[PDB]
Amino acid sequence: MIKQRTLKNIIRATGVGLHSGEKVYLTLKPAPVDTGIVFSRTDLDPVVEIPARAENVGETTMSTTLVKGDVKVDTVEHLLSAMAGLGIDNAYVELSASEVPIMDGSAGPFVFLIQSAGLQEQEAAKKFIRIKREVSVEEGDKRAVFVPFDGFKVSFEIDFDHPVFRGRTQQASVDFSSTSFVKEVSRARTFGFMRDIEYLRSQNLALGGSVENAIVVDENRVLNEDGLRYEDEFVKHKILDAIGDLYLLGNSLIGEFRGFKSGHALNNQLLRTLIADKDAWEVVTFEDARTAPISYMRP
Numbered sequence: 045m046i047k048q049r050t051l052k053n054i055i056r057a058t059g060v061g062l063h064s065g066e067k068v069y070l071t072l073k074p075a076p077v078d079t080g081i082v083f084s085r086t087d088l089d090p091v092v093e094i095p096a097r098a099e100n101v102g103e104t105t106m107s108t109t110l111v112k113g114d115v116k117v118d119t120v121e122h123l124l125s126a127m128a129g130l131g132i133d134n135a136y137v138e139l140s141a142s143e144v145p146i147m148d149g150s151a152g153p154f155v156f157l158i159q160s161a162g163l164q165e166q167e168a169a170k171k172f173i174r175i176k177r178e179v180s181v182e183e184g185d186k187r188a189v190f191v192p193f194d195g196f197k198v199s200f201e202i203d204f205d206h207p208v209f210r211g212r213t214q215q216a217s218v219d220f221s222s223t224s225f226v227k228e229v230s231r232a233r234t235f236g237f238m239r240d241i242e243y244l245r246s247q248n249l250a251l252g253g254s255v256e257n258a259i260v261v262d263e264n265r266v267l268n269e270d271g272l273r274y275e276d277e278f279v280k281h282k283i284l285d286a287i288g289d290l291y292l293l294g295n296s297l298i299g300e301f302r303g304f305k306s307g308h309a310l311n312n313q314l315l316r317t318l319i320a321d322k323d324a325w326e327v328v329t330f331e332d333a334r335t336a337p338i339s340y341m342r343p
């Protein structure tokens with residue numbers, strides 16, 4: 045049977061909150077079968093646990109935030125992308141503050157942390173959600189859709205005026221496995237637009253934001269092409285974000301996601317629309333590994 049996975053070891057890291065600019069202490073811990081990913085705010089008394097589930101997503105701009113009452117965890121998308129990428133079913137994520145550390149602005153540092161802690165197979169069937177019927181949402185001319193597909197395919201197109209994009213759209217698609225996630229998408233940084241970052245900095249926001257965690261762009265271009273890791277890196281980052289957002293399903297997905305100018309808000313609308321549409325998906329488990337669609341990093 046394809047087994048559920050947790051971490052083999054407790055593993056700690058330190059980084060800066062993207063908005064706070066202050067140190068955050070991150071602890072990844074093993075968790076029992078059927079826990080899913082649980083964020084835990086250990087700076088609070090009592091401790092506040094928020095399951096990484098679609099229903100717990102708060103309404104925020106340009107990042108995925110989890111909310112329980114007045115308590116929040118900001119910027120969960122990159123860590124959840126790494127958890128999805130290496131097939132981590134079950135873990136506690138402890139934080140000293142309301143933000144996941146931004147690290148280098150990709151999932152790379154998180155992949156290194158999870159890899160290094162090691163993958164522990166657990167004595168329970170891994171549950172997958174198989175898309176059974178097409179589900180789409182539209183907002184203006186933005187679109188996000190799931191369709192049935194035997195695998196995990198994530199496709200994305202973006203279209204912007206800014207001269208950095210050279211008058212054209214950026215398109216990319218990943219046929220997802222642990223290997224293709226790590227290689228094609230995991231280190232992709234987003235564009236930090238100088239005009240936007242300066243505006244946020246005047247409000248004592250994005251204090252942790254810099255060339256260390258974004259590709260900085262001026263009125264016309266990437267200032268340092270040196271800092272680029274991929275072609276069409278911006279859309280490859282959109283795929284990274286999506287994989288992290290789609291993991292708020294609480295299980296590995298079997299089907300195809302196509303995003304047209306989508307983002308965290310519309311991804312979350314699609315997710316919640318799919319969950320509410322009970323005949324459009326089913327939970328499956330696999331007794332013979334060799335007939336499962338998705339390749340994951342061997343433990």
Ligand SMILES: CS(=O)(=O)CC[C@@H](N)C(=O)Nc1cccc(OC(F)(F)F)c1
Nearest residue numbers: 106149234236241250253254257258307
């Ligand atoms: C733009 S998006 O829709 O792709 C969403 C991107 C979002 N997931 C993200 O990674 N933002 C991000 C990362 C590092 C720095 C930063 O702030 C800075 F540096 F830009 F201010 C912002």
Ligand SMILES: [Cl-]
Nearest residue numbers: 187189302304
């Ligand atoms: Cl479409």
Ligand SMILES: [Mg+2]
Nearest residue numbers: 321322323324
């Ligand atoms: Mg239906």
Ligand SMILES: [Zn+2]
Nearest residue numbers: 121234281285
């Ligand atoms: Zn991102």
